[PDB]
Every structure is written in C-alpha cells, then in structure tokens.
Amino acid sequence: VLEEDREPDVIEVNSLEEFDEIMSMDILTVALFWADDCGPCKLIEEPLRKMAEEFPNVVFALVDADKNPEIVKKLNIKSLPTAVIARSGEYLGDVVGARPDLLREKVENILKNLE
C-alpha cells in the first residue's frame, strides 16, 4: 500500500479529509478522477503532467476513484476521467472525458481573470 513515485507537480489524494483540506485552500485546484479500468484516463496522463508544469499557481490533484469512492459519491462523478476545478471550497467548472485541451483552456481562462 506504500510507495513514492517521483512526480514533481501532481499530488495524489489519499482520503476525503485530505481532498476537503486541499479544495478548501485559497488556491485554484484541479482534481482529476481516474481509475485503473479506464482507457481514456491513460490519454490524459502526460497532458496532465505538462499542464501541471505549465500552470504552477494551480494544484493538480489525482483522485483514484477505486480507492476513494466516497469522494466520487460526494461530487457525483459518473464518468472517468473527470476534472473538477475548485477554489476556496467552491466548484468553478468541470471537464468530463479525455479532453486535455478543453481543460487547459478552462484553467487558462480562469487564471486570466484572476490577474
């Protein structure tokens, strides 16, 4: 159950209590819900890592849906991957399915307006 793979930018979320603490922060956050049994999730893996380098002011947080069904049920996640965008505890937007360029555009547009 223990491991530490070298991912400089993307966080792995391991509990509802850790999710709620991250999403409550006064920081733009993107939570990406994925699971092993999800082909489209594999298409988003490298784009997500590149996005995390592209937008350092943003926390990119991965949620393994199989390990964290409570977080899935809390947010009504129905399809994987789903990306949820949040700040100081509020839902700002989402991207359903393997649409990395749409997610990039949504994050970019919010950051533009935070200036």
Main-chain phi, psi angles of 61, to 5 degrees = -125, 125
Asked if 86 is part of the footprint of ligand NH4 (rule: CB under 6 A), the reply reads yes
51 is written with which tokens? 């996005």
Contact 73, 104 (CB under 8 A): no
**Residue 26-55 contact track with ligand NH4, rule CB under 6 A, x = bound:** ------------------x-----------
Min dist. Cβ of residue 57 to ligand NH4 (A)? 18
Say whether 68 is catalytic.
no
Asked if 95 is part of the footprint of ligand NH4 (rule: CB under 6 A), the reply reads yes
Which of 14, 25, 53, 91 binds ligand NH4 (CB under 6 A)? It is: 91
Helix (H, G, I), strand (E, B) or coil at 27: coil
Respond yes or no on whether the N-terminal peptide bond of residue 47 is cis (omega within 30° of 0): no
